[PDB]
């Protein structure tokens, strides 16, 4: 026989992840952010001044050279602040924030949409839909209503 | 011999119809290839951090069979043909790496028949995604809910990597088991941080930050990043299907 | 709560995404991203010669695998 | 019983030539591309060098006996030799000469692998 | 009649040397009257004239499987039926190489006896569906319909070299049209018949409940030919002979047949099936 | 109108064997599959047994009136009979005989089903 | 003329019964002259000759959409264009069943009026893209 | 050598024209879109007006010699005239004369620029 004609490359090698070092110098002046929904990024290694996440334990904020950490993202909004004083908000659907001591952010999410493409009016009907689902006694619809309200209530308070 | 000319005319008109048919397949293929090339410009960023957790040194295949008990393979095949040697090279790879303790839950319709006819009992079933909508994270989650049924020890995802229009090669993701990945993480978090393979990134600060992370969140970290790995496999094999089909169409023409 | 009900974290994320795609305004963004939430796939396992659906895991997110 | 089969297999291969030249080998069931890989072997095995055409083919002429022809085709027909490549059946007589041609081909392939190895190391 | 094309070639060789005018394909033109003068003499006389007859089985050579030439068309125009022998089927392994879709007979049931009518009336309906489905590569290896089973076993039963007695054919086709021979595989269909005709298993193994119906006497033709199988006094005996032949085969012989792995015995069994394909 | 509509259907039906023979039924819209089903049903419906061909077919012929030959085709034209299977149209007369045949095919379908159950329980 | 192919058949019957020398498809030689004696009498005369005009619409029957036949191959070489009908379209409710690709009118615009030129200039630049789109797109 | 280089250029541009429809013009390398621009200049340069239709269309006809045409095509191939736009080569003759059209186009463009600037500054 032929001695293993094929040799498929390990696909992980195609990506170029960081080498998170313990740090033998100073800290950078601005985080290098990289936001990714399902497969495609909306932001790739952009310099940014600050970022504010919403997590299950609570609401967090980050700057350059924040302590190394990794954690969930509550289904809600995400605030970002560039060095130019402006801001950028993104509605998200869960995810995992990956902050580094070098100063780097890799927020892998499922969905990421700007606020501009959302209307409070369409959210309004979905509120009472979620409330009716929660009040409808059924394990198949109750938790679906609790989750729908879990995602509308942050938007409900972010819009107002 | 008035019949021979009608036979040859009829073969000519048949091929003339077949030409515009294959031309229609060609244009329909380019309609979705132009749609899907946009991923190429926005490629190779969503697992810049996932690899640092699950990547490993080039493990041998003869050793893991002895360490493991029930392997697993996710070969992503296609639903409709005129592609190329994709499903064929993916079948020659599995029979090339075939071994007693394995099981296959594939994707695509051609692995339905080809695997069952070349792999009698190891192959079990497959998943089929009608390509009316682009793939979703939920589809990869449905694939993980299929994989979790088997008590698998290592899951080798296989797919087609689109390096360019003239380059649709193979590629793989080696997924350890969740319990075994956590044991590797605990064994690694103690000792000094040293890379055991060229091009492998250090991950000790991550493995300790995760060591602080609670059980439910680490289990979501694992099912999440394995879902992204599966999803990248689907998007890359989809691009390879729409990329090699045009060559296996213009050669038919 | 939803955790102990039997649904996974992945079904949770997909449900949230399916809900978010509803509320956002109509445009090319929604026109594309609804593809990322529509459920159209299926599962099949081959019999001796016939095709059959391995329905042990539903594609709809409200249900619970068993 | 051997020749009746041999005719039958080539009869199927002719039907598949109309498709393989359209689509290709990869667009066929595993039964069909097997039968093709076996019929290409048979049709190539049907050739042989004659002592008269030494000027043309530059190969010594063989005299295939009847009994060894039937034992070879029967073995090739029952899949007794399927791992053997296609070109080993080309312009030869007797299965022993086939397996010596396959040995030469494998030896030359390995030799080119060592040669590309050393050419890469020196390069 | 052997090759009638040669009977026209001689007519051409004569007329053209006689300075007659040629026509289409160099023939004189009136060759249709030649073959009509010959073949319309074939007939079944009225009882006034003794009720005699004479059948004609003229043979016509063909080149590259065409029916477009002049002579072939003038002859098919006259003859009732035609038995198309396709080289693509001859070379396909099966012999006699008839292509049933191309070959017909313009008499039908009125020729054959009372027994063959009820069988052929089912066989035509069988092949009408098998011809439509047999183009499909068998993927329902266990969900293959009864039609894809029976049609292929019937084609295997058609394989012959020499002729077969009437009795020795109706039972062989009754076994298929009712599905008795659906459990065994395709290759062993003729060896199943070889025993069904020459090696009566129930007579050997003692499964003798049938009073008379046995395939050794060979004169039961003259009753099948008169009464027919679908009758009060032959249907159940037929069923209680074929179900036993099937059981004894599937239990004693098929169980041995699938258990062979040696090449020396495999070849011996294959040649045995080929011999049964020839002698029957 | 009914005759020109049917002929236009069959005119497209040929262009669909141009495609179905290569790709398959799966590569066509449900509105294309519908006209395929209708056309194939028309192609088999328009067949008929004759009493003179009893020698050939062994089946009784039907004398179909012109007026009855219009409300049945138009019925098939507007989906009045789409749930009705395919082979109910082959070699039958009016639509009454069609439904009479569909009841028979369904009867022998339940026959093979209950016989399969009894064979599974028995063996 | 309904139609010329039977006119040629008659000329064939006469020449062959008169022992004249036949040629392709048993027609004599001068059949192309037989038609050119006729069709070229069709013309638009000059104001010096009354400005009269004789328009000819010769019909010819093809067989299985063949055009390489001797008569059709000759009449096409004579006429100032043609109209090609297709039975594949006459059955598909496209009545008249023209075939715009093979149909030709060497007099493209100069015959038409002032109102038609601007319209036909659009229709040519519409059907030219319709055929490419209907040919490349699927059926469904 | 000039003619056969133009042939190889136009053949290559035809192949790249059969590839642009698949990938996109930006997919090509820096050298490929260079020769594509040169072919787009060449094919337009082949267009020549006529003294025949000068009364009909108004444009003049240029009787280009042989030697002058060779030096023009050799320049157009050597890359020493690439900055000139594509449309300048349309329906003209002789490289000494196309630049009159190029300068006329640049001057007319600067005129429209100055006209839009003063039209905006006035308001």
Numbering used by the authors:
A (entry chain H): 17 to 176
B (entry chain G): 3 to 255
C (entry chain I): 2 to 67
D (entry chain E), F (entry chain F), H (entry chain D): 379 to 501
E (entry chain B): 283 to 562
G (entry chain C): 283 to 422
Show sentences the authors wrote.
The mitochondrial ATP synthase is a membrane protein complex that generates most of the ATP in eukaryotic cells. The translocation of protons through the membrane-bound Fo part, mediated by subunit a, drives the rotation of a membrane-embedded c-ring and the attached central stalk, which together form the rotor. The torque of the rotor against the stator subunits induces conformational changes in the (αβ)3 headpiece, thereby triggering catalysis. To reveal how the mitochondrial ATP synthase is modulated by lipids and organised into a dimer shaping discoid cristae in Euglenozoan mitochondria, we determined the structure of the ATP synthase dimer from E. gracilis.
Symmetry expansion of the pseudo-C2-symmetric dimer particles was used to classify individual F1/c-ring monomers into rotational states 1, 2 and 3 and resolve structures at 3.0- to 3.9 Å resolution. The E. gracilis F1/cring maps of rotational states 1 and 2 showed strong density for IF1, but weak density in rotational state 3. Subsequent focused classification of the IF1 binding site suggested complete inhibitor binding for rotational states 1 and 2, whereas rotational state 3 displayed a mixed occupancy, with a minority (34%) of particles containing IF1 and a majority (66%) not containing the inhibitor. Unlike the bovine ATP synthase, which displays a nearly equal particle distribution among the three rotational states, rotational state-3 (20%) is less populated than rotational states 1 (44%) and 2 (36%). Rather than reflecting dwell times during rotary catalysis, the distribution of rotational states is likely dictated by accessibility of the respective catalytic interfaces to IF1 binding, which for rotational state-3 may be sterically hindered by the proximity to the peripheral stalk. We observe this contact in all three rotational states, which provides the first observation of an interaction between the peripheral and central stalk in the ATP synthase. The position of the lumenal H5EG1 on the c-ring β-barrel remains largely unchanged in all three rotational states, suggesting a mechanism of transient rotor-stator interaction during c-ring rotation.
